[PDB]
Amino acid sequence: SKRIVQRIKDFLR
Amino acid sequence: SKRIVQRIKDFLR
């Protein structure tokens, strides 16, 4: 899921 | 990416 990956990336940035 | 999600899930299991 692109949505899920981007959410994790944004949480950790 | 389904693969990327599954990679993260597997790393944390």
Residue numbers in the entry:
A (entry chain B), B (entry chain A): 1 to 13
Which of the paper's sentences describe this entry?
The hLL-3717–29 fragment was suggested to serve as the active core of the AMP, showing a different spectrum of antibacterial activity as compared to the full-length protein and other fragments, including being the shortest LL-37 fragment retaining anti-viral activity. Here we demonstrate that the active core peptide of hLL-37, containing residues 17–19 (hLL-3717–29), formed supra-helical highly stable fibrils that interact with bacterial cells. Rather, the fibrillar assembly of LL-3717–29 was comprised of associating four-helix bundles, each stabilized by a closely packed hydrophobic core. To conclude, the atomic structures of human and primate antibacterial LL-3717-29 showed a functional supramolecular nanostructure of densely packed amphipathic helices.
The gorilla LL-37 (gLL-37) sequence contains two amino acid substitutions when compared to hLL-37, with one at position 17, the first residue of LL-3717-29, substituting phenylalanine with serine (corresponding to a F17S mutation). gLL-3717-29 exhibited slightly weaker antibacterial activity against M. luteus compared to hLL-3717-29, with a MIC of 53 µM, similar to the effect of the F17A mutant. The 1.1 Å resolution crystal structure of gLL-3717-29 displayed a similar assembly compared to hLL-3717-29, with almost identical backbone positions and root-mean-square deviation (RMSD) of 0.15 Å, differing only in the two N-terminal positions that lined the central pore. The overall structure of the two is highly similar (RMSD of 0.15 Å for the asymmetric unit, comprising two helices and a similar space group and unit cell dimensions). The N-termini of the helices, with Phe17 in hLL-3717-29 or Ser17 in gLL-3717-29, and Lys18, line the central pore. The pore of gLL-3717-29 is more occluded, due to the orientation of the lysine residues extending into the pore. Similarly, the mean MIC value gLL-3717-29 (equivalent to an F17S mutation) is 53 µM.
